[PDB]
């Protein structure tokens, strides 16, 4: 019997976004760019704010949405962390890059998040998977 | 208390790889390209073989390894599925693309895998996270 | 004797950027995220403004700078065009995505740009290469 | 009057490819993975062979083809160079990564290529643009 990975609560994000700018409209799919204008990061590991970032999404006529994003967290104690998201919406996979010694452990983390309330898509809870 | 996602066993991969070709060697990190020459896919959902694909890795002097890969599964019943991997080795995040009607549900899946035996890095077990 | 491609002036961009947020500082290289906060697009083909976008750069101790960016142009006549940049700074390669019928021809274009004045890195002139 | 960049002949590639594996077939577009199984590299700067690599393409019902590829050149004198291609077919933009001291200058190069004969799509001539 394969052994499943362990899940540990990592952080939450309460994001603010600009309007979705559709650049590729067709009967088959809509592709958009959306700015991440800010956000609150909370949790037992790091808290802080989202400085900025961009999301690219493709919304299929079939209801499938694939999104890729980068955004920059700045922690309360001044560390910069790049967040790399890849999603099969509403499921979001996450990688991290930082040279902060306090937060360096995130360079080895795969995380995963989803909005706990699918009526509030800009509030996500993320889990460390290992 | 945040609610964790559910984990369901998805597939295993027993991959074959060519040699790692280092193209960027420095004291700080090694970057390599590695061909995925084949592999066995097994599990309760799909079985088949790996047709081909490429992995790009960066191995830090700090022991962190980040890898990105694409490879193509062909199922026993003839479906082509693109696998998009992004890893903080040995933890691997996975997305899928197919137009197969039988396997279309994978377009909405985030999966996650790791070698159950870290002495055998080319055998991974993957889980659907949702 | 190989035949070189033809070069036609395509557009200029006068970009505004936020501060460079360094997330990965080491003796070997600096990696940063920078927001594209706006900009003027001009030329004989399209004019308009930059709505938004993000640049990721790595600046080597060796002086090499590699950058990738996405930003969204909105033309004077309301068309949305995604610009995908990949650079060996100060040389910038460009692709485009739009479903605008007026600007659809850009989906088939490879462009290339550089600041005419390397003291003014945020003003670039771009050329259609074919 | 904007000043155009200079074009210098860089290399040619005579590539071999495996079959195109379509993973996403629809009336709107076809997405495929294709293995680069080998190739001859020639020119005044470097000659050698293609070790391997993968191309991902999307072929629109509208005739537009967008492709992204990575492949590894090994020069006659043993240097490994990663080639990163992004194309609006048949126009191909190119970046390079190597730590070879002899070929390090390619890390600062944007190149561009196209098949001189569009009946022979696997033979391309590439130009340094700067």
Residues of B in contact with D51 (CB under 8 A): 21, 33, 35
How far is it, in rounded angstroms, from Cα D48 to Cα A15?
A: 50
What's the angle, vertex CA B18, arms to CA B68 and CA D100, rounded to 5? 75
Distance of CA D65 to the CA centre of its chain: 14
Q: Which two tokens stand for residue B101?
A: 């009607």
Chain C touched by A24 (CB under 8 Å): yes
C104 backbone dihedrals φ, ψ, rounded to 5°: -55, -35
Residues of A in contact with D26 (CB under 8 A): 28
How far is it, in rounded angstroms, from Cα D121 to Cα D116?
A: 8
Q: Chain B: nearest CA to C43, how far in angstroms? A: 38
Resolution in A: 1.6
Which among D93, D79, D97, D91 is positioned nearest to D116, based on CA atoms?
D91
Chain C touched by A68 (CB under 8 Å): no
Chain B touched by A91 (CB under 8 Å): yes
Q: Are B75 and B66 in contact (CB under 8 A)?
A: no
In this complex, the chains that touch C, judged by 3 or more CB pairs closer than 8 A, are A, B, D
Which among D123, D128, D89 is positioned nearest to D107, based on CA atoms?
D128
Give the 3-state secondary structure of residue B75. strand
Residue with tokens 């790399």: A84
Q: Are D73 and D83 in contact (CB under 8 A)?
A: yes
Residue of D25, D26, D66 for testing the chain A interface, max A β-carbons within 10 Å: D26
From C26, which residue of chain B is nearest by alpha-carbon distance? B28
Q: How many helices (H) and strands (E) does chain D have?
A: 0, 9
From C86, which residue of chain D is nearest by alpha-carbon distance? D95
Which among D90, D124, D129 is positioned nearest to D108, based on CA atoms?
D129
User: Which residues, including other chains, have CB under 8 Å from residue D107's CB and lie 6 or more apart?
Assistant: C62, C64, C66, C88, D96, D97, D98
Q: Which two tokens stand for residue A86?
A: 């890849």
Residue from the list C3, C4, C112 with its beta carbon closest to the beta carbon of D110: C112
Per DSSP, what are the bridge partners of residue D13? D41, D124
Helix (H) or strand (E) holding C59: strand C48-60
Which among C21, C77, C82 is positioned nearest to C50, based on CA atoms?
C82
Chain A touched by D26 (CB under 8 Å): yes
- Tell me the residue ranges of DSSP E strands in chain A: 7-17, 21-25, 29-42, 48-60, 65-75, 80-88, 91-97, 110-114, 123-129
Q: Are D98 and D76 in contact (CB under 8 A)?
A: no
Distance of CA B83 to the CA centre of its chain: 7
N-term to C-term CA, chain B: 17
How far is it, in rounded angstroms, from Cα C81 to Cα C104?
A: 9
Q: Chain B: nearest CA to C61, how far in angstroms? A: 11
From D53, which residue of chain B is nearest by alpha-carbon distance? B54
Q: Are D84 and D67 in contact (CB under 8 A)?
A: no
How far is it, in rounded angstroms, from Cα C6 to Cα C12?
A: 18
């Amino acid at each position: 019997r394969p052994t499943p990975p362990n899940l540990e609560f990592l952080f939450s994000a309460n994001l603010t976004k600009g309007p979705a700018y559709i650049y590729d409209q067709s009967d088959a799919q809509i592709k958009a760019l959306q700015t991440l204008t800010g956000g609150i990061i909370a949790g037992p590991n790091f808290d802080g704010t989202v400085i900025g970032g961009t999301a690219l999404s493709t919304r299929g006529a079939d209801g499938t949405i694939r999104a890729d994003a980068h955004y920059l967290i700045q922690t309360s104690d001044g560390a910069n962390i790049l967040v790399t998201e890849s999603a099969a919406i509403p499921y979001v996979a996450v990688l991290f890059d930082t040279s902060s010694e306090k937060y360096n452990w995130l360079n080895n983390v795969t995380a995963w998040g989803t909005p706990p309330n699918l009526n509030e898509i800009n509030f996500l809870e993320y889990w460390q998977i290992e």
